[PDB]
Design a protein around this nucleic acid. Structure first.
Lengths: 151, 70, 117
RNA sequence: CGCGGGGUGGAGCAGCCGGUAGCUCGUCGGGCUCAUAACCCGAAGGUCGUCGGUUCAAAUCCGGCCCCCGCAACCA
RNA sequence: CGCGGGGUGGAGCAGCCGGUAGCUCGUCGGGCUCAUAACCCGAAGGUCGUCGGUUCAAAUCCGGCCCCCGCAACCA
RNA sequence: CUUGAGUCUCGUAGAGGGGGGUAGAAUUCCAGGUGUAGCGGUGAAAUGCGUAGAGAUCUGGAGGAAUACCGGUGGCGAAGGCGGCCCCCUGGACGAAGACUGACGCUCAGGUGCGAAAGCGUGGGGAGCAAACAGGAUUAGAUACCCUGGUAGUCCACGCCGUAAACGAUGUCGACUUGGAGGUUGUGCCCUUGAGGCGUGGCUUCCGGAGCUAACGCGUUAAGUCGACCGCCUGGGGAGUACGGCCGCAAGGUUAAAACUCAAAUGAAUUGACGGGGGCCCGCACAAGCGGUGGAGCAUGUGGUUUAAUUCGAUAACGCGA
RNA sequence: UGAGCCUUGAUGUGUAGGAUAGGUGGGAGGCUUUGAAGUGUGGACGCCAGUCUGCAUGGAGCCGACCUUGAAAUACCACC
């Protein structure tokens, strides 16, 4: 907004692992304020993922996230007659969010049956460095690279 | 703006110096001026207008200054 | 090809496009590169970054000649002016002289008419 | 009839040694875009005309056939 | 009468081999638009003048007829 | 007679004029070298130029036009205008003292001359720029703006044209009336003790007093206070046009009506509103996000059409009065 | 500057692999004081693994069927 920047609201860490990031992810996943179901789904995804990759539940998730975080995104300035997409260094708070969102989107897209399962699959893909979220990230990066002349 | 890098001089410093020299020359400005033909009248007008502006800045503003703002 | 230690970099910096040309000290061109050639078109090639990359390309091209010392001659107004020379420096030549060589007439030919935009 | 070019991904131009199997525009997805095009990324389209053989590499070298070219010569 | 162009979607200009059946403005539809002219998306309008035949491709090659053109020649 | 007007003496500054030389930078072209795939251009493109070697880069040559910096609300000129440097011919201005002439002055209808740019004639020249023209864009169209080219013309000589917002939109000459800050160019004195100090002349930029003015503003360079002479105006349109004359190669110029027609037309300033003017600021206004509507079926209101009637109203109206 | 030729040299990565296998026939040891393996490197090619070769140093050994393989050694060889 114009007038005043405001302090981001307080977020509680999830009961299972005691993590803020996890909680955020769960929130993102959630729909129609049905938090509980969403959190259950998330947990399920984690468990399966853990089983698959070993490690811990949280650590694996973190790793997955890491492979889909964008260093740089673009924005539309359009000062000229035609529009110029300009790259911008995307901040720590935002980058984490974006990756999560992308992952969620991928999960939603995916052709597997249960939501949780789909999510798990997505996570696995991210970890391995294939899939939808990763592709999206690449695209984002690619665009930035293309428009690197603007800065 | 001919320049020679001195012995044990940094590159950046040299570049800066060059830039300064260029500025002094007013080469870029000159180039800009000669990009397109300015009608004599237009040239005259700008010069006089600019002068007028300068005069305004010098005297009127000085007068204003005498009186405090708050 | 005969290797040469010292040469000139001519940097033709226009408003629309930068052209870097490395030559020997006598005048004979060794290699060249351009912002338009480096994979930039229109809005993109009239930028400092583009110029820099052109410069880099040029440098790469004159690797076989084995050029260590380099004097730079900068021509025209543009973005590709400071940037290009920086790029050249990075590429790793000892920059010896940095000259400006913009053609300034002493009121000679009539320029074209002013654009109405 | 004889003699020089050779025969391909919707069309076209594909790196002297047979192991590289394409690039442009095109159609679809997406990215950006006010737009459209340009621009970025990726994706479906083969026989290498054909019949064979020298060889694990063959369309990729050769024997014949069908055509496209080009040849220049002929015609009671 | 003889001889050259050919005959279409409300009008007009439609890719040498008969298998492609259009594009402009127009009317409707809806939001853009301070307003419409809009940009953009989609939608109704055929016979291919006609009578036949070579052929599964025909209006699309040919035989005749009706007109539109153009022809240049004629006229007691 | 000497105070106006002029002449003489010595200096002064000046893009004042005419003529003839020359210098350096840059553009263009030509010839050649190096070199290799782009160049160019725009908001974005394309036309255009490029592998027949462009663009870039260096060497040599040709030719034309204009004179960076100095350079300034600086200077000179009656105005138009005048800008590298040098020479030749040449007009004016100002100051310093004296000396002389002795009203010789001011203004000026007709008349005469000079008079930007474009334009015309004849002969030269032609680099760059560029009306016309052509193509490429843009667009509903684009006979424009933008891009790529491009011929008259711009340049020179000698003629003609005789007009421009030829403006300070302010005729010329003279006298008189408070001030300040400069610029420029002389000149007198003063220890120039220093770039200074005190004057006194010319031209000039800005601000402002009295006064003047419709106001805006002008204000010792008047638009103040007066005198001399001339030019010009008499509502807007029709019209600076027609006819006639004079001038012109022509383009056209100049002089200059009438009918008819409207009750306005204008100037300055004022309050608003508006601006694809400018500054500052705000709002789920955008941006950042989440969920919808627009497609489906149904509910519901409206438009329409239908009906004997489909009650009337709302149209920031349309699950609204209800 | 193009381009032939008597001649004597070099040149040749399907994967199995000692690793830059053109093919046929005569063949089990060719070269080494008109100087063998290891070292220093000047110039070439290149699929970056290496290959051929000049001059220096060194002075008494490297390479064979080999294990594999559609085809066996550049152990000598002539034909191209």
């Amino acid at each position: 907004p114009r007038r005043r920047v405001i302090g981001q609201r307080k977020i509680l860490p999830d009961p299972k692992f005691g993590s803020e990031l996890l909680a955020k992810f769960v929130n993102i996943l959630m729909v129609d304020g049905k938090k509980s179901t969403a959190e259950s789904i998330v947990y399920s995804a984690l468990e399966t993922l853990a089983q698959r990759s070993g490690k811990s539940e949280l650590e694996a998730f973190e790793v997955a996230l890491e492979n889909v975080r964008p260093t740089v995104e673009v924005k539309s300035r359009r000062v000229g007659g035609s529009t110029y997409q300009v790259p911008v260094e995307v901040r720590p708070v935002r980058r984490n969010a974006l990756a999560m969102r992308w992952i969620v989107e991928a999960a939603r897209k995916r052709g597997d049956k249960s939501m949780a399962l789909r999510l798990a699959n997505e996570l696995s893909d991210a970890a391995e460095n294939k899939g939808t979220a990763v592709k999206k990230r690449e695209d984002v990066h690619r665009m930035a690279e293309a428009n690197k002349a603007f800065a | 703006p001919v320049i020679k890098v001195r012995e044990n001089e940094p590159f950046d410093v040299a570049l800066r110096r060059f830039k300064r020299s260029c500025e002094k020359a007013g080469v870029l400005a000159e180039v800009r001026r000669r990009e397109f033909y300015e009608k004599p009248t237009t040239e005259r007008k700008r010069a006089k207008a600019s002068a007028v502006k300068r005069h305004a800045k010098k005297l009127a503003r000085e007068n204003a200054r005498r009186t405090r703002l708050y | 090809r005969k290797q040469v230690s010292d040469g000139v970099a001519h940097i033709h910096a226009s408003f629309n496009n930068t052209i870097v040309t490395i030559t020997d000290r006598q005048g004979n061109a060794l290699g060249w590169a351009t912002a338009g050639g480096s994979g930039f078109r229109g809005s993109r090639k009239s930028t400092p970054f583009a110029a820099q990359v052109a410069a880099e390309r040029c440098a790469d091209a004159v690797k076989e000649y084995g050029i260590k010392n380099l004097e730079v001659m900068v021509k025209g107004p543009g973005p590709g002016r400071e940037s290009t020379i920086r790029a050249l420096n990075a590429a790793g030549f000892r920059i010896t002289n940095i000259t400006d060589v913009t053609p300034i007439p002493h009121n000679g030919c009539r320029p074209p008419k002013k654009r109405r935009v």
